[PDB]
Design a protein around this ligand. Sequence first.
Ligand SMILES: O=S1(=O)O[C@@H]2[C@H](O)[C@@H](O)[C@H](O)[C@@H](CO)[C@@H]2O1
Ligand SMILES: O=C([O-])C(=O)[O-]
Length: 780
Amino acid sequence: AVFYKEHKLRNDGLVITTNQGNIRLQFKSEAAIEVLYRADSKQLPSFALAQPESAIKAQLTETENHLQFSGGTLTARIQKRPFAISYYRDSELLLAEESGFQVKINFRFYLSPGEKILGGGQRILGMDRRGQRFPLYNRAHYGYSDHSGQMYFGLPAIMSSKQYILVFDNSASGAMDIGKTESDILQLEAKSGRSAYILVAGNSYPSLIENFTQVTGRQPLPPRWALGSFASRFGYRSEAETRATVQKYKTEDFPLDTIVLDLYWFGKDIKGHMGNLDWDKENFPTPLDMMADFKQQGVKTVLITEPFVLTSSKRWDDAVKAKALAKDPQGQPKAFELYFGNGGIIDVFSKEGSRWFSSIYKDLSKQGVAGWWGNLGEPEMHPEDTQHAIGDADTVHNAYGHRWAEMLYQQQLDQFPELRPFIMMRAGFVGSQRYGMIPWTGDVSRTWGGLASQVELALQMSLLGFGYIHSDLGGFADGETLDKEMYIRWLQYGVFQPVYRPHGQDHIPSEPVFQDEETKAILRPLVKLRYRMLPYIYTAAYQNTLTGMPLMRPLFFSDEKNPALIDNKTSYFWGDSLLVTPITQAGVESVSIPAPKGVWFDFWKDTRYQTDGAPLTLPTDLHTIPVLVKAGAFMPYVPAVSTTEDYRSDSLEIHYYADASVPLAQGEIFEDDGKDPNSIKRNQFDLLTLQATHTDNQLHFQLARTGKGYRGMPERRATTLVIHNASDQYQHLDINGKTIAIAQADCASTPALACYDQERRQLQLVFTWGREALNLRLHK
Ligand SMILES: O=S1(=O)O[C@@H]2[C@H](O)[C@@H](O)[C@H](O)[C@@H](CO)[C@@H]2O1
Ligand SMILES: O=C([O-])C(=O)[O-]
């Protein structure tokens, strides 16, 4: 039994006093509030908030039985007796406390009937997690397939169909019960740590995510090369083998930006060497030459590092001596048995651990390393009596990887202020995106079920801040012989998800260049397609940096007033315009795609479909997976290159999908130098926009460029605009008032400026796109 006693308004925050203690409410923006219970006491600081000490002016009003604390869109309604806070956007009930806070740490809230709940991060349980209970304790799930209540990267956060996000801003071993134990109760609990939650509201799912990333952090734009092709396996055993793999990509004509080196770079065996963090010179004898030779071919090098230093490693004595390791309660270095052997964990929460670890990254980055892979940051083993500078293992567990990322991000920005850090990690916390974390879904089995779970995993992480969530393409764990069909399907899906990184245990090849002729004839043009689509992908990335909009969006974005779509985890949006339906079983002959009402085109075949609600049945083939294009889409391409180091947009090819049903459409292409962390902030970019206006007798395109440009930017781009489903009635074209006749023959066979292909229903326009506005008008 809890009740209101008294309140103060101080430094813009409302401090309430109950019979059981102090509660501090600070608005972190107009649509986001931090509620800290036990505000009187010493607690761990926030990990989730990008600006933990901010509070914006709010309107407090008092009545008899209630208080009302309001920012712009979000209102906290604080009932006095019994004490219960509830949350409103306008006068719509988002979320009400039941008992609220208790003692362990425990928060309890009501769930409205029919409310659907996404969240928890990586779980394979269904998209609506209501009716489920699971732990908040990051932990490996080696060889998972079609089920998991607990894996590498949990998030103490949910997204509701009421269009709010709730963050349990707590790093400790805990649990989430989403109306499982009691129908109508959401319960959050932890063993220790901060007793705080954060509620964020939105008018729509895009605005919600914008609001969320506003307060938890925005991903800075990764380097363009992160959207390229990675060569990876576990693992290249030598410099010779790694040079041969870069060579194989060249001699097989597959694009390649980055080669990833697994744990054999620092020692000849899986066991016994972890913590060396230095080249195994018997197997990598000339690594500066190696990395420089690769950079001559436009190829970057990424190295795996782990949080553990083994007692058998070259660096044990030094790490002990520097006080870099986490300690036991006696106060000496804590050592424990890992798979790899006996060892300690680097204390990234301490000054001495951070400096020691940072110095090692600095030395290797100076040698040529372009990016970093941080593996096992759950941490994979983490005994409860391990003591970090700010708390014990069970208190800090779910923030270890988060702090590892922050440490490494700050370090890379300090060493290379003109480059974008590349940081790939397995485990983090809410807001780790603000440190550039690129997560992957761990050690997935080489099974169809492993593939069939990846969309669910990607969407759950994308919705809560992680745009670059991806999988080990082809599958990682076990298997004895390649499942060729599953592999092909996985690398096809690969094209339409955030990072193109095939990776697996090296008894079966993960790289597409090591596959048979049929497999390479299928995948080679799709990996080239990935490169041709870089303007589309990089523009989605730019939008993610601006607004948190993820690259993969769920089907439920298409209709916010149909909550039944929340369950779908087989069809998703890649950017604004493509609905992708991966094939997740062997031998599937056709698919039923639940395309939103409107007009859609087969991406591969140009076929036009219209639907008023009913699904579309498409046949399948081995060469592709089913992709529909939304009418009104602008799909931009550039010619395929071997490496994004050679990237050029001097030649653009843009495909517009016309339909009279879409009378107004827009597209955007974001260009910059692909490497500068300050390009957006300083406006050192070239933002191309395209607007189509489609009426009964006219189709009109308005083209423009904004931004201050960048070094090497083309002043003029050769542009081919291909209009799919173009009317055969268009008589003439004006380009900036200059009339041009539309040829009706020989389009593929003449240097035609405007030509209609009657057999394909495509109108092709070729022109020069310079810095000034350009208007193209077609009239009947
Ligand atoms: O248990 S593993 O086989 O899976 C772990 C990682 O998640 C993989 O990405 C990595 O390639 C392996 C070697 O460093 C690790 O051992
Ligand atoms: O829709 C049009 O404009 C047509 O097909 O003629």
